[model samples]
Target: QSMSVKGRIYSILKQIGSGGSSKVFQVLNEKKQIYAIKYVNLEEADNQTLDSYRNEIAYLNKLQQHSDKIIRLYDYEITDQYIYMVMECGNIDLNSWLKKKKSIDPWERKSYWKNMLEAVHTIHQHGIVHSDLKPANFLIVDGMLKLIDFGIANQMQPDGTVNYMPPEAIKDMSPKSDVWSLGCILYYMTYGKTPFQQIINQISKLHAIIDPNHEIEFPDIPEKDLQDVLKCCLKRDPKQRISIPELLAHPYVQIQ
Candidate 1:
């Protein structure tokens, strides 16, 4: 139940989760405080594996100085065979949390949306674009939403998953790249599915908006303003997507 990393004793309470190249464990520190530890075995460290781990560590270290909106990095160590990081622990990811609720109150949704935007804005301010923006990357901590996992984050380069990524990501990356993904996330939150879920080819789906017959739909919500914001976010052209500053000031996000 206990493991030693760099001479520090960590009691591995349980395996919280696992990803493609890493496993997350709920561990207890010497102080008995709980922390999430992401462990990656470097035995099969390919270029992709090293890049993902290093990128996440770099961004997490940089964000440690700027904002608490992201998961706090408590400690990290790299050995010849492994890389591990101890960070703030949370109850559940936003996606799972959303599934548990029958429906979200409009006001509460607005608050959470606002928090997410603010966190994204903060990261952008620090010259980083969180190329992947989705509910799965957000954790619920004591009623607050904390963004996590910067594996594919880039400062000025392109890095993102195809499903939530914009067309421009294939050429270059920008803050607007994140705006597009944010729109997809908002759509998912509203309908429990990404905007192009029905489409088979990702590129074809992204281009479908240009077709005369294709139309984006929004569910009826307590606020009509959100519809307008999503329209701006889902724009095909990167230049057409709403800027973070403008989004922050948008009526739907500024709701009390």
Candidate 2:
């Protein structure tokens, strides 16, 4: 069992956000660094559950130095009532940011995707798979894409939720999942609509995730090059999906 940190707590601030396992609170560290501490109630975490928490902490510490795709983790400790993790806080996720702006310019949109592709490609090259690539999990920090929440992210596997997830990520469990989600992000960047929110429940979930209904049109983007790349990301077969190396080298990101 690790030592509790509440004794060192300097403030009890208002809740700023929440996630699968914890709620975030703003706090000033001993060095005066402003950080967000995610607190998970200890009663809710047993030995097996704590191990998973530790896995995420361990992964973050090691992976943080490898890429700018992720936010930085300062430290972590447990309290009598909860387990806490201190980390750098990002302002807003792409989903929320797009909602506020309504829509983005075409060139700016393309640039965002290009940079995001590079960040995600870094994660894949490191052998760590961010299994969940939803827009809400992405943070806009210092005008760059900072991926948050690796609770579900782990080593790549041929069999897992990625294989059975919605068609957007069905192409493969690798960085292509990020590409599929990016396609959806671009869809929202232009049209201000979520493909999952637009289709999942209304259409067949199996089709929505694996073989998405293509009734939704691509508004501002040309169907020629752009649509072709999006389709490659959302391919139904994992093997048929475009690889990260191949995508970074694609004309869409390279030449364009």
Candidate 3:
């Protein structure tokens, strides 16, 4: 079966991705172009969930016009049963990209890390906090990374996931919170596992991550300068964490 709205029809192709309660499907439109449709089942969703969709679409509409670093939103519809958003489809996210070249050099690493920070900085520049920052939250469209999923992100035009959220998450939500998440992302991209990945294959992984005693271990990577960049984002104390502008100024990002 197909879905129709506003005199346009979309043929749902296949399930592409999902987060929380929302499922994204690859769809073909009247223009016969490939796009992704993200829809949430309203049956079990509440106001907070619905508000997220509104936030996601609003951010997509507000931010993507002049920039290619952010994902593009073509159109949307809110019905009694679901909310659907039509967007550019990209099969590549950093997760799979890492799978290909996990053994990368400093220059390539710096390039991707800088690119990721640029996307995050764009959101921050617009006065938004990315409460959730993770590799999967980025989509590679037309060979460049773009931010995706503003569902839980907010308006000050803000923020994705557990492995990326900060320790002070339950206390306050701010751009610093995003910096912590970015640090985690940097750690993962730099290495394959997360900072607290030590807790993997163990019981109650959350405790190790949330515990103050469990310090993150860095493997003395060859590119020592990047370690400083990670420290700027991953500081246990949010106050000590460097701001986005300062992060971009790090010697690691400035490298050729």
Candidate 4:
């Protein structure tokens, strides 16, 4: 169900994993540095959706080296039915770690949350919003967080993401939408589950759980400031949500 591609550009060492419409390979660059190669299937895409991929490539091209959290886009090439791009890869994502650890200690959890907020702040500075900020989208390497996968990221425009999403982005897209996802991540980290109870999980749509009626209670964690920031980000109205810069400047992050 897959084909191998290699060149002087990079040596393909192993195929790491696969995703919804793509596959990931572990490769070594000319210098023997490891990276992830995303192979997107063109046949799996139509004109409209393929345009999204093109836009993503363009967007990633612009911000590849802008932040330490983002995976670097080294180079890319196209084929009749595929688009393969080489990227700087992190060792493991937060979701994978969580699956093994089940729950994180207070300090580890706080650190992860802080790093993600900071990463998003940096991304926002570059005029991008990682509209989809689930735990599955973040990586942890050497104790630092690196955000990956910008497939559905908001470049200049907004909209088209509103489940597991912030209230401000519920009706329409906004930078604060990332903030909402941030909040959802915080809730998940604290409660070991989503704040939307069990119903949304059954349906797999965030819109079903973004309402004010969605009940969420914070754990007895020491990171009260972190909780406060997440609460503001999860506000039902985007206008009321705290901006990324404000979040980055919060006291919780300052306590370091």
| Model 2 spans > 4 angstroms off | 1-13, 29-33, 79-81, 153-165, 168-175, 195-197, 200-203, 211-216, 219-225
What are the Cα lDDT values of the candidates?
Answer: 0.77, 0.62, 0.73, 0.70
Per-residue CA lDDT of candidate 1, range 142-211, in tens? 7788888653722111013356867676545289988888888777666767777878876787566445
Give a tens-digit lDDT track for model 2, residues 56-90.
77877887788878778877786556777777866
Model 3 segments beyond 4 Å from truth?
Answer: 18-21, 99-101, 151-161, 170-173, 200-215
| Error in Å for residue 212 of model 2 | 7.6
> Judged by lDDT relative to the true structure, which candidate is superior, 1 or 4?
1
Alpha-carbon lDDT of model 1: 0.77
Instruction: Give model 4's TM-score versus the native structure.
Output: 0.80
lDDT of 4 by residue, 177-200 (tens): 888788877777777776665654
Better of 1 and 4 by TM-score: 1
- What TM-score does structure 3 among the candidates reach? 0.81
Q: Of the candidates shown, which would achieve the greatest TM-score relative to the real structure?
A: 1
Model 2 CA lDDT for position 138: 70
RMSD of 3: 4.4
RMSD of each predicted structure: 4.3, 6.0, 4.4, 5.0
- TM-scores for all candidates: the values are 0.85, 0.75, 0.81, 0.80
Please report the candidate that would top lDDT against the real structure.
1
Q: What would the per-residue lDDT of candidate 3 be over residues 1-256, giving only the tens digit for each residue?
A: 6887556899988877666567778889888889887777788877776777677778778888656678888888888688777889976777667767677666656766776778778777778787767677777777677777553533121112357767787444378888888788778877878877665544345566657787778678777788788877888778888988888887887765
Candidate 4 yields a Cα-based lDDT of 0.70
